[PDB]
């Protein structure tokens, strides 16, 4: 057994292996999510496809239950083992207390798994950040995120990945109340958001909405070809 | 102080020429590899007389390029080992923020391995501005092809947008490395315009080896 | 007590495992040894010089049998060899207690080289400093395999290990063909060990072991003197 | 004892980690493997390295390893590290068959091994594997599949990929000559001999220098056929006949 | 100094520096003075605080009905040996049905704290135990140190500025083996006014006294019942 | 160059215990005041973004029905100590059929605070206030990353800790009431925080002898603010 | 002790069980449910002692729901039934063997409908019809009397009607009510809770 303290304090009060892992998040591909009052909409950008690969084994939006979706950034090898440990826990909740898992509960499991893992012996911390999105019982759509140090944190709109400060500055000057008016109008905010990011001009973006009673339903590159037309068409006439 | 860092071939040396184009100051350049000497103490003597030259002329600009090379590569000419590299850097650490009256001397530095060198040299007071250079973005890439193919009689066969995403992280240096090479293939056949198959065999020659 | 539980063998920034590259230097400074298979059996021949006249040459042996039909020589350092001999003696028994059959020579090298790879990754250990040559005649056809401290293995027709191994491989390439008997391969194994020995190659400076379909055995110095006679 | 510890698990101050990038640096050199599919069948084209004139040429394969009764793998990197992985997911497929009495799907065999490979990069103070490898196979859920593993622990589905020494040159030409769902298992073979004509610096394409194995679906068989050295060279010269025709007529 | 890192490493002079640095930790805590008569064992502590509204940190603890201790150093390792101290007293009372003798208790501590002073990656216990108790042989004053070396003594003082208290105890210890409980205590109280700056001494909220006695169970006096003992002292001469 | 985690200084303290004392100077500030009428206890939130939901974060959390808490420094490892305190108060109720006192909760946590090493891995970088009403009335305790706890009367912990303590020693006296202790704390928090004071940047909680642990919410809270 | 039945047709599986949760001599609950879903086309019908029928059958249910989330598709009825047989057989030679009797019913899009049979010794059996409990001794003889491999689902219900009326003539237990399912290409469907009025 390898017993060595990896994460230790700095002489001024930092945890260096934590904040080095935050920079591995800061060059993964961008993931943006907002919530509507009835339909949540989150979609990663930079699919970065090379037209010789299977398109389904590269997906970064998975589901933990029927109601809880999840996107991430950072490095993918650490991601899909946190996900598989979350799938066991949200299934073991049902053998216990009968209701399906509330979206706040599954964030506390991931965040507490991630903290104690910056505390044990001989373990580097995880290098991912996540967005947990779900519409729980009694239909209240909400989302969260998870820092690699393990601080779960709710939001109304957020973005992580490479180029996340510029998108977060873009949303606050754009997030109104009437932006979440229609289920097709909230999507026009996300498609306007990631187009203000690394280019992804309809060819590298994959939105995925959830209408509070469905599962995840990814629109194929025909409505995004339709939406990016009309989002740029309104931009064509006003300016 | 101003330092410039980033991956190799992104335009660190390219930007310093634009400053020396523009300025009316006297402009001094030295490479970091030639700071190390074969005799003992000839290193720190060379630094002291550099800033003597820079101060005695004018408002002046001292450009020191590739300063990570003072600490990475060990050479058998240097009789003092790593503890002659060290004594030179202590003199360089003096000449940026000594107690002497400095005068009007601006210092520009550039490297591509920013994590290797001494953090005492990058403290505020010696270098204030720290400028990162990223890789060229794919809409800034198209601008670079517009520059290096400006004054060439480019035939209308070619499509530049296929050339852009060829390497996913091709630097600005690679673009000039292709555009200069494709012109060299045309002079093998005495032609005046550059066709598409020039570029098709160009990236095989430049990138893939 | 306890161990270290961390690998002291890491990747270089040039992408090379440096400790394995150093272990091959200790193999190359060993005693020279050649091995030749030819169409009815395998010949293993090594070079054993005592440092002085005080040593008892009939006490230790370079050529060792593993079972009825598998022999094994080395070229490296001494005390590492006796460890993985006693390991390979045991591995041939757990195959036999399960299957009631002598082990194939291929499946032994599957399991001996798995020990050497496991030993260059685990915590707190330096790799072995020996390379092996393994013979045997399973199901008529003979076999000749060579392992290395990294844990790989090969299937040679004829090869040399030890000092001046790059000269022996050029010598065997100009000598070996498909069609030889066992007594011809003995004569050309002495002819390639004479490239690097001293002036006197007596009946006790070398050590030769053979396989047949009758099984592995090791030559006594009586007939080794007869093979050393009328040689070169 | 903490003076001798090399800390093969920690991050670097720039954010990335050095140890697996040194391994993927070593995965570039020493080997060449590629695969292709568009229709019924899938192939693995691999180039032999040790072509010395004194070897026995046995064990039915050199870098091809049959894993299940209907899937196989081609490996690249440290060969000794490869022998531990190959007989590790060989019994992952068998403990699946013990548990469900059904052959394992080709995708979740890859995810099972790439979790073992990911764990050494993450804790234990242990040297990771410098091994990347391909996966062909068939299952009833999706048919012919093609995967690729990395030493970091992340996999991916593909259609044609090379992990050779000039693998970037091969991929750049695979996405120059390709067709989605129309490359039958003769045009892919002619395309396979075309690609390793380029990336192999040893010219003239010695038939003993390469190995090609095909996986075709026969009704209850899924025949994995390592094609012999008598039909390689006629496929070699078939590439040679058309290239003298195409050069002279252009 | 590369010989200055781990407890295992000997110095070339032969003095392990990690043990010598734990002696610096006991010199940081406030002073305390223990002494004994023929029939009594009295230890007196001096508390400290952080602000004027925060409470004062206690130092005298109750181990058993005939054993009490006083700590100096970091308080977390003090409770680690205190919970070991209480456990070793009541199981001997569970097995043999007798009070565990004091001189046999301290040798269990000396074997307890010597173990992490020899392994790898194990700190010493920075603590300043003054022990007062009863055998069948009368009172006993024992002190320990992080070098796992316990001392039999008749009056000692440890903590910050304790050398001035030791000079007072040497020139008055001929009187200690005769007096009753009253001026035995205020002999020790004149040692704590020695180890202070010349303006504040004994303001009834920073001092504590613990006595075990020949027919008296170990009793701690805190900040109100100190005042009968504390009255009857003369002014500081200047 | 690299020491172990368990090394004394030449001045004798430690290295990483003393480094963790520095880490709680980056956390948000928090004020607790003990009054004989009851314990009031407040904090700021340090809201970063307008898009952020404000109530998802918390600093006041309850341990039992009569004991509240307040955390500073890091947050993610504070939740480990909170869960050990909640379990400890329920094991004491299960085995003794009573309520664990406020002091004995604190030493049950403070024994856990210094247990790292290389067997069986770093000290916790939080600082806690424990407000509660046991049978000795209202109590107020303060622990350390070093595991040292002491009863305080008006303790201010966070990035503005030493600036607030000086302004808090002048207004506190032993005969306060709870209605003026609540008002006196928000005068101090109005000075030290960055943004303006409203009903969303801060939150309070008071524990009484009569009723149990009560946390204020955004309806009864702003009558203190508009009548500051 | 209590009864369930397994008629399997060409493109459907008709299953039914009782609804009585028993006690010493009384019946605690008259509308109990012995039916456990795992997928959209796989059921589970468990009979045995008190604790093991509840906890084993929901242990299997959390492993089948987990397989669908990790992969995106469901188990076949062949593989789902054969995963259960490994779990009894491994826990058989233990300190706590489960004592349950069960039969699993499933539909697949490749091999059509399927019915499997198990006991408390974990022996599989691919059967066209099966039954557990003491009512199996009474009711198997009617069922092979009238079984056709090509039987329509309308007359398969009235065969089950005939198979239960004899169970309320010569069987000493009470058993008034019976809950009925049906499985097809469209998934699980609830049929009429057939019963006999004791008024
Ligand atoms: N962003 C750019 N726009 C236009 N040209 C560029 C750009 N980046 C690089 N180039 C071309 O690349 C050539 C070399 O660039 P330069 O040497 O300045 O990069 P560098 O980062 O300084 O290289 P090094 O890291 O080796 O010092 C220049 O002559 C320039 O023409
Ligand atoms: Mg340059």
PDB file of C-alpha atoms and ligand atoms in Angstrom, chain B residues 6-15 17 65 112 136 144 147-148 171-173 176, ligand 1:
ATOM      1  CA  UNK B   6       3.986  30.755 -25.116  1.00  0.00           C
ATOM      2  CA  UNK B   7       4.507  27.743 -27.374  1.00  0.00           C
ATOM      3  CA  UNK B   8       7.279  27.808 -29.997  1.00  0.00           C
ATOM      4  CA  UNK B   9       6.517  29.546 -33.258  1.00  0.00           C
ATOM      5  CA  UNK B  10       3.597  31.708 -32.171  1.00  0.00           C
ATOM      6  CA  UNK B  11       5.131  35.115 -32.816  1.00  0.00           C
ATOM      7  CA  UNK B  12       7.290  36.035 -29.848  1.00  0.00           C
ATOM      8  CA  UNK B  13      10.285  37.076 -31.924  1.00  0.00           C
ATOM      9  CA  UNK B  14       7.873  38.399 -34.569  1.00  0.00           C
ATOM     10  CA  UNK B  15       6.393  41.047 -32.302  1.00  0.00           C
ATOM     11  CA  UNK B  17      10.586  43.367 -34.803  1.00  0.00           C
ATOM     12  CA  UNK B  65      15.441  36.509 -26.210  1.00  0.00           C
ATOM     13  CA  UNK B 112       8.929  29.378 -24.302  1.00  0.00           C
ATOM     14  CA  UNK B 136      -3.591  30.675 -33.363  1.00  0.00           C
ATOM     15  CA  UNK B 144      -2.373  34.630 -41.471  1.00  0.00           C
ATOM     16  CA  UNK B 147      -0.871  37.852 -45.064  1.00  0.00           C
ATOM     17  CA  UNK B 148       1.713  35.371 -46.324  1.00  0.00           C
ATOM     18  CA  UNK B 171       1.382  27.517 -35.433  1.00  0.00           C
ATOM     19  CA  UNK B 172       1.846  30.765 -37.296  1.00  0.00           C
ATOM     20  CA  UNK B 173       5.318  29.548 -38.176  1.00  0.00           C
ATOM     21  CA  UNK B 176       4.859  30.596 -43.534  1.00  0.00           C
TER      22      UNK B 176
HETATM   23  N1  LIG H   1       0.420  35.161 -35.406  1.00  0.00           N
HETATM   24  C1  LIG H   1       1.212  35.243 -36.494  1.00  0.00           C
HETATM   25  N2  LIG H   1       0.881  36.008 -37.543  1.00  0.00           N
HETATM   26  C2  LIG H   1       1.659  36.100 -38.629  1.00  0.00           C
HETATM   27  N3  LIG H   1       2.813  35.442 -38.769  1.00  0.00           N
HETATM   28  C3  LIG H   1       3.263  34.636 -37.790  1.00  0.00           C
HETATM   29  C4  LIG H   1       2.467  34.490 -36.574  1.00  0.00           C
HETATM   30  N4  LIG H   1       3.124  33.647 -35.772  1.00  0.00           N
HETATM   31  C5  LIG H   1       4.251  33.282 -36.419  1.00  0.00           C
HETATM   32  N5  LIG H   1       4.329  33.869 -37.615  1.00  0.00           N
HETATM   33  C6  LIG H   1       5.436  33.675 -38.556  1.00  0.00           C
HETATM   34  O1  LIG H   1       6.345  32.759 -37.962  1.00  0.00           O
HETATM   35  C7  LIG H   1       7.675  33.253 -38.051  1.00  0.00           C
HETATM   36  C8  LIG H   1       8.462  32.932 -36.793  1.00  0.00           C
HETATM   37  O2  LIG H   1       7.740  33.360 -35.650  1.00  0.00           O
HETATM   38  P1  LIG H   1       8.552  33.613 -34.300  1.00  0.00           P
HETATM   39  O3  LIG H   1       9.926  33.034 -34.464  1.00  0.00           O
HETATM   40  O4  LIG H   1       8.403  35.055 -33.911  1.00  0.00           O
HETATM   41  O5  LIG H   1       7.793  32.686 -33.251  1.00  0.00           O
HETATM   42  P2  LIG H   1       8.473  32.505 -31.818  1.00  0.00           P
HETATM   43  O6  LIG H   1       7.420  32.016 -30.869  1.00  0.00           O
HETATM   44  O7  LIG H   1       9.262  33.741 -31.505  1.00  0.00           O
HETATM   45  O8  LIG H   1       9.481  31.305 -32.119  1.00  0.00           O
HETATM   46  P3  LIG H   1      10.460  30.757 -30.981  1.00  0.00           P
HETATM   47  O9  LIG H   1       9.522  30.284 -29.914  1.00  0.00           O
HETATM   48  O10 LIG H   1      11.208  29.654 -31.673  1.00  0.00           O
HETATM   49  O11 LIG H   1      11.307  31.936 -30.596  1.00  0.00           O
HETATM   50  C9  LIG H   1       7.573  34.747 -38.232  1.00  0.00           C
HETATM   51  O12 LIG H   1       8.462  35.158 -39.263  1.00  0.00           O
HETATM   52  C10 LIG H   1       6.160  34.994 -38.678  1.00  0.00           C
HETATM   53  O13 LIG H   1       6.175  35.401 -40.042  1.00  0.00           O
END
